[PDB]
């Protein structure tokens, strides 16, 4: 058969609750236990229905749009591989959530920026610091398990970087990034005011940085300076998305996407790095497709 996993209706930097996934999956083939708090809060525990080969298709989440940079989102990445799973196995599924869009804004001043008549952030740039207008990074989607007393990653589908506030007027996507080494470090993205994405094991250096799985994987908050400026700022998505400031937030991944270290007005956040465990049989390479939240589809192979 087929098993479809979602964010259970959840949005933003925080993952779903048991109640949300219970309602989302009622009447479908999917039953999960949702992590109630702590490190794996919002992570969906799925009992594998018997030994066999499973094609796992993981989709990371898209980044947010910027207030004056909204032609498209950086799409979350699709990765897929076939896994040999045994009896009694359980998988852990964190469905990445979309980086928040700058628009519609969450305050009167931020909604003024979205209507385009306000140029105050731009004017104060290139002249206490004025900032805002960026989109948060999308969360990556993580498929993993417990083996020999360690969390073991199987698939990580990278999230998209959020868009910067602005884009160059004369503007007329980057290649998908893949890690396939089990020993590889799951470090985080660069950043600053705008947050880099969280990786598999990264440590967040700020409230804006996307959190890693080791930290609970929540999206980063929007930068405090933009909250001070506009009364609101876009957060990264659950699954390690970085918070926006003026530059966009980085996408979550096995390694997180880089965000600007100078809150540059035109600097889109970069996408996360996907991961396909090298013991699996690759099905299809990483391909950016997702327009909104991530998801996971499992089918027998």
């Amino acid at each position, epitope marked *: 058969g087929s098993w479809l996993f979602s964010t259970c209706g959840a949005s933003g930097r925080h993952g779903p609750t048991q109640t949300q996934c219970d309602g989302a999956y009622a009447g479908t083939s999917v039953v999960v*236990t949702v*992590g109630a708090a702590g490190q794996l809060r919002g992570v969906q*525990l799925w009992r594998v229905p018997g030994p066999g080969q499973y094609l796992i298709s993981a989709y990371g989440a898209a980044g947010g749009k910027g207030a004056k940079n909204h032609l498209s989102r950086a799409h979350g990445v699709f990765v897929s591989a076939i896994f040999s799973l045994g009896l009694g196995e359980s998988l852990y599924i964190l469905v990445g959530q979309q980086g928040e869009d700058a628009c519609p804004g969450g305050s009167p001043e931020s909604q003024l920026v979205c209507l385009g008549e306000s140029r105050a952030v731009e004017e104060h740039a290139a002249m206490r610091r004025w900032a805002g207008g960026g989109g948060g990074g999308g969360g990556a989607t993580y498929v993993f398990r*417990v083996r*020999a*007393g*360690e969390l073991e990653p199987l698939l990580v589908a990278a999230g998209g970087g959020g868009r910067a506030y602005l884009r160059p007027r004369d503007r007329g996507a980057s290649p998908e990034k893949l890690e396939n080494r089990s020993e590889a470090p799951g470090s985080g993205g660069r950043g600053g005011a705008a947050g880099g994405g969280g990786g598999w*094991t990264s440590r967040a250096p700020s409230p804006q940085a996307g959190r890693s799985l080791q930290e609970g994987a929540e999206g980063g908050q929007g930068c405090s300076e933009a909250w001070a400026t506009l009364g609101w700022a876009a957060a990264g998505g659950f699954g390690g998305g970085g918070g926006a400031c003026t530059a966009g937030g980085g996408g979550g991944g096995y390694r997180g996407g880089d965000a600007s270290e100078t809150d540059n007005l035109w600097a889109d956040g970069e996408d996360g790095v996907s991961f396909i465990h090298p013991s699996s049989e690759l099905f299809l390479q990483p391909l950016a497709v997702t327009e909104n939240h991530g998801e996971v589809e499992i089918r027998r192979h």
Partner: nanobody
Amino acid sequence: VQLQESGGGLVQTGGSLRLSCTASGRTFSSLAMGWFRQAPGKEREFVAAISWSTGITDYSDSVKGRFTMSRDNAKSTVYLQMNSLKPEDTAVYYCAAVDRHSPGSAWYNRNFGSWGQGTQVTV
């Protein structure tokens, strides 16, 4: 943050060893500790776990009844009383701060990849 195992040794079939593990600079959200073992040529495997506060324990089937895990909160130390030992128990025994997704799910090292030297047990 920092863990150290001791108490390993060579023993015959039957009879007991008492392993200890001390933990300096606790995490204050690290609620549980766990014993794992790795015999030569096999994967590290769960042995037992315990809560710091309640002292409630969890055991793998291979050791249930023969191994008792305990802890001393004031000292930040956990113990493994291994009785009725058997040659298949030979392994390097490792201590870890552990967590689990939910009741009934598998224990994992909350400090990813962070493992001490362990203590050698030979039966």
